[PDB]
Write a protein that binds this DNA or RNA. Sequence first.
RNA 1: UUGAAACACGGACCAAGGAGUCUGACAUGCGUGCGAGUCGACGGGUUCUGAAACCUGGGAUGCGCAAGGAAGCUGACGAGC
RNA 2: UCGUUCGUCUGACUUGGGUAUAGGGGCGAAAGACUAAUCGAACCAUCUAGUAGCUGGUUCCCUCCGAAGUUUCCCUCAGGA
RNA 3: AAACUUUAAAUAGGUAGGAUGGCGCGGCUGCUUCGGUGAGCCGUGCCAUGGAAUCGGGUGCUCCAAGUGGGCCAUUUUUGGUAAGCAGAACUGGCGAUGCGGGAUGAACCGGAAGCCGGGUUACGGUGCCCAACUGCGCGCUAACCUAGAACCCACAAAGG
RNA 4: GUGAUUUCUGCCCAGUGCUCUGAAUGUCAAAGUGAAGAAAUUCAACCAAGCGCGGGUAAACGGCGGGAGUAACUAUGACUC
RNA 5: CCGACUUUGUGAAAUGA
RNA 6: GGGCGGAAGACAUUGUCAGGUGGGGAGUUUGGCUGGGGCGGCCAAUCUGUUAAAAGAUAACGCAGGUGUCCUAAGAUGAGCUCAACGAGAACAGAAAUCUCGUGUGGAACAAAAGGGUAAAAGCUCGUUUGAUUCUGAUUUCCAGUACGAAUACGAACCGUGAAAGCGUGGCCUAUCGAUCCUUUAGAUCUUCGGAGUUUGAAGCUAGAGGUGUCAGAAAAGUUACCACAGGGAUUACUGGCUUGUGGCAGCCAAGCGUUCAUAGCGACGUUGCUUUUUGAUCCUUCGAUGUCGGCUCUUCCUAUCAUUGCGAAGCAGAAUUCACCAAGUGUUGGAUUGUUCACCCACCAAUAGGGAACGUGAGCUGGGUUUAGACCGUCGUGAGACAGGUUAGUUUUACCCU
RNA 7: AUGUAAA
RNA 8: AUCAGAGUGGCGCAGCGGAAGCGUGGUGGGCCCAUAACCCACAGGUCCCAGGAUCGAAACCUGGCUCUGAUACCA
Lengths: 98, 50, 251
Amino acid sequence: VNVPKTKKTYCKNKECKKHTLHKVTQYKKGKDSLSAQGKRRYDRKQSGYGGQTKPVFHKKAKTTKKIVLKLQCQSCKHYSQRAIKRCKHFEIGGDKKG
Amino acid sequence: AKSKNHTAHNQSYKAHRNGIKKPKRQRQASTKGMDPKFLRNLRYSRKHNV
Amino acid sequence: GRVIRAQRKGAGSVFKSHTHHRKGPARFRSLDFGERNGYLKGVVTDVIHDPGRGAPLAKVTFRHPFRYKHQKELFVAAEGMYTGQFVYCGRRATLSVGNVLPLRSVPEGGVICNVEHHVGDRGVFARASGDYAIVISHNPDNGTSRIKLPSGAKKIVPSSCRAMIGQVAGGGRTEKPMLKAGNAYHKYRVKRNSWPKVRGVAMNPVEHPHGGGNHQHIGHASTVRRDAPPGQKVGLIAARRTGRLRGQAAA
RNA sequence: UUGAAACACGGACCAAGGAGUCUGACAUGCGUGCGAGUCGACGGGUUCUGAAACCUGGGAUGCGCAAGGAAGCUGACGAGC
RNA sequence: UCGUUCGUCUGACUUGGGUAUAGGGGCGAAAGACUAAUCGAACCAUCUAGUAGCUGGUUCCCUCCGAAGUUUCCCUCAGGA
RNA sequence: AAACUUUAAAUAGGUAGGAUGGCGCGGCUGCUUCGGUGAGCCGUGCCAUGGAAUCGGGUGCUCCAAGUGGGCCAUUUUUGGUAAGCAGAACUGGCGAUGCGGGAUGAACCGGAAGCCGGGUUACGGUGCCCAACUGCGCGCUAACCUAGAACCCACAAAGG
RNA sequence: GUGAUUUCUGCCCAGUGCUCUGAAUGUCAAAGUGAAGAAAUUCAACCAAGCGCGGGUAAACGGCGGGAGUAACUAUGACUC
RNA sequence: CCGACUUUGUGAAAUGA
RNA sequence: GGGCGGAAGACAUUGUCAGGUGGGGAGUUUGGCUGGGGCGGCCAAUCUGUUAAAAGAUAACGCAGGUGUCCUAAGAUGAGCUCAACGAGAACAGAAAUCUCGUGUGGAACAAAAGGGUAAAAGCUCGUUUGAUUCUGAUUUCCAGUACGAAUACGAACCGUGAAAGCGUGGCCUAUCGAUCCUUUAGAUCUUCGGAGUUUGAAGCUAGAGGUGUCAGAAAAGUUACCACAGGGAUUACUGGCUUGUGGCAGCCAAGCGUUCAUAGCGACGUUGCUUUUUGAUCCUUCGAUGUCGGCUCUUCCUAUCAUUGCGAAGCAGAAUUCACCAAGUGUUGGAUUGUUCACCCACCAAUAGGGAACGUGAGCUGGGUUUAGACCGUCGUGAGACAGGUUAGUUUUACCCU
RNA sequence: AUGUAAA
RNA sequence: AUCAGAGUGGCGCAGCGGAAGCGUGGUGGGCCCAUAACCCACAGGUCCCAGGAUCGAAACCUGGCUCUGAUACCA
Ligand SMILES: C[C@@H]1C[C@@H]([C@H](O)CC2CC(=O)NC(=O)C2)C(=O)[C@@H](C)C1
Ligand SMILES: [Mg+2]
Ligand SMILES: [Mg+2]
Ligand SMILES: [Mg+2]
Ligand SMILES: [Mg+2]
Ligand SMILES: [Mg+2]
Ligand SMILES: [Mg+2]
Ligand SMILES: [Mg+2]
Ligand SMILES: [Mg+2]
Ligand SMILES: [Mg+2]
Ligand SMILES: [Mg+2]
Ligand SMILES: [Mg+2]
Ligand SMILES: [Mg+2]
Ligand SMILES: [Mg+2]
Ligand SMILES: [Mg+2]
Ligand SMILES: [Mg+2]
Ligand SMILES: [Mg+2]
Ligand SMILES: [Mg+2]
Ligand SMILES: [Mg+2]
Ligand SMILES: [Mg+2]
Ligand SMILES: [Mg+2]
Ligand SMILES: [Mg+2]
Ligand SMILES: [Mg+2]
Ligand SMILES: [Mg+2]
Ligand SMILES: [Mg+2]
Ligand SMILES: [Mg+2]
Ligand SMILES: [Mg+2]
Ligand SMILES: [Mg+2]
Ligand SMILES: [Mg+2]
Ligand SMILES: [Mg+2]
Ligand SMILES: [Mg+2]
Ligand SMILES: [Mg+2]
Ligand SMILES: [Mg+2]
Ligand SMILES: [Mg+2]
Ligand SMILES: [Mg+2]
Ligand SMILES: [Mg+2]
Ligand SMILES: [Mg+2]
Ligand SMILES: [Mg+2]
Ligand SMILES: [Mg+2]
Ligand SMILES: [Mg+2]
Ligand SMILES: [Mg+2]
Ligand SMILES: [Mg+2]
Ligand SMILES: [Mg+2]
Ligand SMILES: [Mg+2]
Ligand SMILES: [Mg+2]
Ligand SMILES: [Mg+2]
Ligand SMILES: [Mg+2]
Ligand SMILES: [Mg+2]
Ligand SMILES: [Mg+2]
Ligand SMILES: [Mg+2]
Ligand SMILES: [Mg+2]
Ligand SMILES: [Mg+2]
Ligand SMILES: [Mg+2]
Ligand SMILES: [Mg+2]
Ligand SMILES: [Mg+2]
Ligand SMILES: [Mg+2]
Ligand SMILES: [Mg+2]
Ligand SMILES: [Mg+2]
Ligand SMILES: [Mg+2]
Ligand SMILES: [Mg+2]
Ligand SMILES: [Mg+2]
Ligand SMILES: [Mg+2]
Ligand SMILES: [Mg+2]
Ligand SMILES: [Mg+2]
Ligand SMILES: [Mg+2]
Ligand SMILES: [Mg+2]
Ligand SMILES: [Zn+2]
């Protein structure tokens, strides 16, 4: 699945409010912070004896991930994100169909 | 022993013993969901009666 | 599972040494002025059989160096001692069989027995029936010496350590087949309750790692790690190899 | 139990004991008192058979009379067919 | 347990008293055997009226009304919403 | 020709058969139109013999809640199976929860549903005895030297002579 | 572990396990060090055993193949691929 | 099993700073 | 000489953290459906056609199949053209390369399964594009009329295309996907950190993703023949019941065999039945126990007759043998081997027929087999262990009640 | 690697 | 009875749609007196049978055939 490097789409930022010109990136999860409440709770709960307290997931069954496109328009430099359907082979601005 | 059972037996008998309840016909049938372009105008028109 | 036969031995309940008719410890004399700077004459009175041990034991009657009484010491018999023999104990005692000398007085190649390890620990090496240690070399800049032990292991020992000249008597005792459960039983009665021994493969899993199964077989590698927890360190502990030894493997 | 007189299970007979109770919260329904109030329930004073009864506080204790928001906050300008 | 018939009987022999090892422990010439008629985890008391979607029982009369084994979801199919 | 169809039943299915209708008049619209042009509403005034048949008070509105959530039999349609007192479905009724009269006996087949009594008449089923009712009045068929034959389900018999 | 005696114990270290060796420039914690920051903190380098990589071990656990054609009667197949 | 801190003090050299 | 004598020596070691190993040990799990369970499979999410009985709904481990994707175009729009195939034709050129004309209701194509639908299009080519966008509601489908997914119709924006009407909120429609908590991102120059501020961090609100396929979403391997408790005849194996595929039996027609001759005796292709000793199917009674194979003993009954009495027929000369009839009164044996029923031999015999009686018969026996616990071999499993594989040892209780 | 039985 | 696996040169076998090979075997020369052996050349196949999709098949899916390997247990 191919996505153009740049797409004309709506921008809800109060100062665009119109179809402007958006760059395309691909969403990658930011690395997990160690100061989140869920982590200073999971660490505390996990300390001491008792072993594993929160369940750990094993039965992975999917084989695709819903790609998220972080479209940045260059009229206010504000991102907005849109999810595309589940896909395996994904590429932004790939060589077009001949 | 076959855990799966499914019948329509007796179902009409249970249905018809408290009747097939028709909801009451109402004067001023409800306008919920009608075309809001029409409903805005109707509300304004009722607003400006004499 | 339950505690294994090999773990059960650490309590002593039925596994302590049968030590009722033993004749006391077999060891040298207390190291002192006379035995350090000269020689002491002891007369061997009788060579007794010590129950539970393969070697004869020679009772030796010294005269106490500084107070008026005898001293019945009890040595491990070196092959050759007979009642009435004078055994000499000290540094400047001549080198003859039965005498006890420091290793500073024993030339290279000498065959000795009942060796000390820390000077004065009263003799610990080469005591079993028919075992000796060969004194290999002397370093006089350290005051130390080297010896070849019965195991073939080669050890550095302090040079002021005593050692009985000769080899332990009763040699070749283990050369005779016992031919009988009887002889085995009477051997181990006066040593300790470690006989008969039941093959773990003929046990149930609850008491031995090898047990169980419709057939009699170990089931997994019979060699266990050095660090295996007790009750699992059973079999061939930390084996470096297995199989019948051939060639240099038996050197 | 779809199906018991069943070759389904319990019961030889008699007598006595024997199994939806108590407590907390909530809710509907009903009765009583008061009714934008209502509760005196923890205390206090009394109390001549009394662990009762009667009095007392409350000007804000509980609930109710205001709600929407996560929160900062804001908080019903008066109904016609 | 009894009867007859059997095995061994100088030996790894038969046995009394004293004594040691106590419960996930002991002891086992290994049968999961024995550990006080109890052992693939003794016995005694307590937590304890353990829990149970399962079996059994569930106490007076008359009058009146009076069904379901079907939908949906659930590690759900003997169950519950 | 179930996974073919031009055509195309029966049975069943949906809607309508007025008083919650219609017309006239003058008012609003931020909708709608080239536009009083529509669409809708609002105030007011008029008309509307009840607008097929039959029957009848209603869940009409609400609350709280019990039990149930193992089903089975039958006629018809019907899937798998060789068939099944077999398994799974459709419409209906019965049994379960139900006595009562008949089918000799049977949970669901036939009649029929019930307070307790007297009187009469019946349904299904019968009238030789058991057993209340006729060896009733008629007409034929059958002769079984196989236990002739004799009740919807039903307790069976065939092909063939 | 096997089980007197006699006779003999064949092949396989790929797999699992056991063990041995550590040049170091794989991975690899707490501590300890440096840098950024106003500080919490982050980032970096360094980083033990362990694992990895490399050898030994079968009287360690264990394992130990197929398909075709061929002899001058026929059959088989010494032999060959 | 091994690593660090601790009991844990003294002075000496060689390589890094 | 104020050192008891040596050894090692600030290393071992003690304590606290740190990482690895750790069935030696603890705790715990080891889904569901299911014509018993196990193995298999998915009929657990889900789509098309049929079953489905002409509205809707409608099941089975029913049937034929599909889905966990693919796509910046195979989405949106506009314009032009017509497709598969056939017919006649044109150097090399043939059955098939490229071109031209004629016919062409779709016999092509539309990403895929199957159904439906589409022809100046929903197909092919070309131009331009991103409506595959934003805000929250409403409805349909499943539905309890909850959610999710998907779809539909308006509204308020912003745009694409066309000249314009319009069309466009992804794929022509029907399937192609996801809760709470946690993490992470996007947004407001948003809200809080509760003594007041600057200031990192954190906590929020709205909208997405990280995924639960057991798909309304626990984090999870076996074995037990040493086993246990609750229960189940909702559910298996013995008997019984219905059924009779299958096992056994017997009719009808007559192509032929029977040296000639269909029917002495058979009777193929077909076809109709009977039986409940086999096996199968079911799961109706029985799991608060109906004592489970065989043999010994002993009794009774059936006929689908082996001999025995009487008969009829013959390819019946006699002898013997075959077919059938009335016929169940009488009889149907001793042994080798196997636990065996069954089998198969030796011999006698007139004959060595078949069967039923809760596969007659264990408070009648036996205990050989099978079917606990011991044990051995083999194959399997890493292991505990398994074997509808082989072998050995293995308690057989009660009557005095009623009949 | 080897060499008619056909004298 | 179900479930896998494999059907390719004469034999045993490699193969991932553009598409066929490996050893050996066979055919013709060469060396030798002659046969091997050795050197140099030559030709291969119904990619098990029958369909479909696919630019493009022997491979991809399916139906039919033949062999082999497993699982067929508690009673
Ligand atoms: C990896 C993460 C796992 C999972 C989540 O962390 C598990 C949670 C959710 C839940 O059910 N309650 C818990 O405590 C565990 C989740 O949300 C996925 C999207 C992705
Ligand atoms: Mg959060
Ligand atoms: Mg803490
Ligand atoms: Mg910790
Ligand atoms: Mg059910
Ligand atoms: Mg012993
Ligand atoms: Mg031994
Ligand atoms: Mg032994
Ligand atoms: Mg054993
Ligand atoms: Mg163990
Ligand atoms: Mg074992
Ligand atoms: Mg029942
Ligand atoms: Mg009965
Ligand atoms: Mg019971
Ligand atoms: Mg009883
Ligand atoms: Mg108040
Ligand atoms: Mg009113
Ligand atoms: Mg006796
Ligand atoms: Mg004794
Ligand atoms: Mg004793
Ligand atoms: Mg006992
Ligand atoms: Mg109780
Ligand atoms: Mg109790
Ligand atoms: Mg029950
Ligand atoms: Mg309920
Ligand atoms: Mg009609
Ligand atoms: Mg009932
Ligand atoms: Mg009457
Ligand atoms: Mg009468
Ligand atoms: Mg032995
Ligand atoms: Mg190996
Ligand atoms: Mg190895
Ligand atoms: Mg670190
Ligand atoms: Mg390292
Ligand atoms: Mg465990
Ligand atoms: Mg199950
Ligand atoms: Mg099954
Ligand atoms: Mg219909
Ligand atoms: Mg329909
Ligand atoms: Mg067009
Ligand atoms: Mg919805
Ligand atoms: Mg629009
Ligand atoms: Mg399209
Ligand atoms: Mg669409
Ligand atoms: Mg999500
Ligand atoms: Mg504060
Ligand atoms: Mg679910
Ligand atoms: Mg377990
Ligand atoms: Mg055992
Ligand atoms: Mg039959
Ligand atoms: Mg038959
Ligand atoms: Mg049953
Ligand atoms: Mg039973
Ligand atoms: Mg019983
Ligand atoms: Mg009985
Ligand atoms: Mg009984
Ligand atoms: Mg007869
Ligand atoms: Mg009996
Ligand atoms: Mg037996
Ligand atoms: Mg056994
Ligand atoms: Mg094995
Ligand atoms: Mg067996
Ligand atoms: Mg078995
Ligand atoms: Mg030759
Ligand atoms: Mg040639
Ligand atoms: Mg040649
Ligand atoms: Zn913008």
